[PDB]
């Protein structure tokens, strides 16, 4: 069973992999990372696609055309934002009314329009639900850089030089050793999803499969990367 | 003159102060509007400024153009939140987000699908996302028989979806369509207009934008939904 997606969910999914083919036996592949690097290789085999939004998976899948149903693409799970410090946060940020009313370096994971990618409209719906201009102009001011979540990558963009990203949970439980998370706060935050979709006329193995990520077993997996149900 | 580019909704205000800028300078403001495509090539030639209806979308058209813009100048200075617009009388009884959800209903999302630059790109899954609960977001997704741009200057689908997600400047440009049903405030969420000016834009450029900051244009964006705090 051939999965592609953003590098991202990969690495619960790789985990689910593993203990799926050491159970059934079947080869489960998990292709992950920017849609360019793989999109070839997708159009000749692909499965299943997962997805670390909706509109960012809406996108993907259609991009396909005739080999994936938009409509069919299923959420399974959520995460919240969060926000990436510098180690210890030094800076003694808070919340995103703190980043706006600081003078920090922030990086928010906008594709400005070059690629499909989950974070598009994420830092405008938090900060804007303050309901407030200035606050909002202030935020804005303080970014950097608007460029894709870091992903499957190590690294972040301006790592040595930013203070802060707005990022996703489940990268910050991928990578313990980069950065501190710092929760924002609850009537602000936005949740987004993970999400599959099976190719037109899946095989019973890839349905086998997609079904084993409703499983107790997967969801263990996906909770302990911050992916959650309620 | 002084071009304006941007999307269809913001349009009718800005037409609106357009009109007594005119007015009062003497100076000829045009206001462009509707999906990108249709104004591009035109745009490349002449604008003045990009007028946004979102961040998000506002950087892509943006960065559409090279070196006649830097994305870095986007100046955000209104808000608005997004609404339910139902059949007129509201027949279903639609009361937000979750009833959405629970209903046997047909909905319209404001999705590009990566096809264009729009305004609406990922709102529906951040508010129904608000809720944390993984079957409301399912719920709510398996009722949406569209995923398309927000009509802006045209709606999909008119006689055949229960309920648009839109944005409430939409409903005050276009008063005797439909049925504005107002979402949870836990759950709803609030987009900006902006404007950027083009690199070595003229006087009389700057002083429209300034303009919009004025009280006279503050008074007009509030009538069609916009505000400041």
Redesign the interface.
Known sequence: VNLYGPGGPHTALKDIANKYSEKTGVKVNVNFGPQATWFEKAKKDADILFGA???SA???A??FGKDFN?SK??????REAIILTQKGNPLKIKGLKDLANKKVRIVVP?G???S?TSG??????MI??T???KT??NF?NNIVA?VPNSGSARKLFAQDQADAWITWIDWSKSNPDIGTAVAIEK?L?????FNVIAKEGASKETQDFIAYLSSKEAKEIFKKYGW???
């Open positions: 939004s909706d509109q809406l996108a993907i259609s991009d938009v693409i299923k959420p399974l799970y959520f906008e400005a329009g070059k499909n598009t409209g994420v830092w405008e719906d804007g639900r309901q407030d201009i909002i102009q804005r608007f009537d935050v936005v949740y987004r999803t959650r149900e309620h």
